[PDB]
Amino acid sequence: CTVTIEVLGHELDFAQDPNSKHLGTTVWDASMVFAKYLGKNSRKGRFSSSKLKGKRAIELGAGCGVAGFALAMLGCDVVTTDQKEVLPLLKRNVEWNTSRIVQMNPGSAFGSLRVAELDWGNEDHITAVEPPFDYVIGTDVVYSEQLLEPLLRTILALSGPKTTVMLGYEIRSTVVHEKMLQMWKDNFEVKTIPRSKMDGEYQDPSIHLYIMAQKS
Ligand SMILES: Nc1ncnc2c1ncn2[C@@H]1O[C@H](CSCC[C@H](N)C(=O)O)[C@@H](O)[C@H]1O
C-alpha cells in the first residue's frame, strides 16, 4: 500500500500500513492540503527560498511524513517526529523520497530532513531535538480532547518569541473544535489561511490551515 503524490513537480511515494491500527500509518488529507499550500506560496514571502535560508522547522505527529517533506523541499531544515511505533515507516518514507528528489535535481539544495522520536510532553524528547525552532508544524494532530494540552505544551516548549506555528486541521467534533479554538486563542495570535491560498484541487471545506504567532 503506497500513495503517489505530486509536490513541487516531483512524484513522491509514501508507504502506508493499513494492516496497522496506528493512525499515523495512513496519509491524512490535511498533510496533502498543507503540502499543496506550500507549493502555491513558495515564490515570494516567508516560504520562498531566500526567506527560508537558515530556518529550522520541527513537525509534530508526522505520521507518514508528507507535510515536513514538502517544507524541506522548499529549503527549510526539518526535524520530523512521531512516536516510536510510527518512526520506521516515517524513516523509510523520508529516505526513499530524499534519494529520489536529489537524483532528480542534483544541483538543487533541499533542506535537511532528520527523523526523531518525540512523545508530546516528554521533556527529554523535546530537549533532544534541540529547540528553539523557527517553525513548528503539524497536520491533523488535533482530534481527541485529551491530546490538546500535551500538544500545546509541546509546541510552546519548542518555540521562541519569533516562532511561527502552522497547523493543518480537519474539523470533526464541534465540542472539540471550540475547545481547540479557545486554547489556541489563549496562547497565540491565530490567523486562518483563506481558501484562495490553497490549491483548487486539494481543498475540502472541512480542512483548515492555521498560522499562529507567539503572543505578546
Ligand atoms: N502523544 C503523541 N505524541 C507524539 N505523536 C502523537 C501523539 N499522539 C498522536 N500522535 C501522532 O499524531 C499523528 C496523527 S495522524 C496525522 C499524521 C500526519 N501528520 C498526516 O497529516 O497525515 C499520528 O502519527 C500519531 O502517532
Author numbering: 4 to 219
Quote from the publication.
pmcp97, also known as CDC48 or valosin-containing protein (VCP), is a hexameric, ring-shaped AAA+ ATPase (ATPase associated with diverse cellular activities) that can extract ubiquitinated and nonubiquitinated substrate proteins from protein complexes and membranes. One example is trimethylation of p97 at residue Lys315, a modification introduced by METTL21D (also known as VCP-KMT or NVM-1).
Since the AtCDC48:PUX1:AtMETTL21D complex did not crystallize, we analyzed the structure of AtMETTL21D to gain insight into its mode of action. The crystal structure showed AtMETTL21D in a premethylation state and crystal packing of AtMETTL21D suggested an automethylation mode with residue Lys56 from one molecule pointing toward the active site of the neighboring molecule. First, it revealed that the lysine residue pointing to the binding pocket was indeed not trimethylated. Instead of a Val-Trp-Tyr cage, the plant enzyme contains a Leu-Trp-Tyr cage. Therefore, we suggest that the leucine to valine substitution in the hydrophobic cage of A. thaliana METTL21D acts as a switch that shifts the methyltransferase activity from monomethylation to trimethylation.
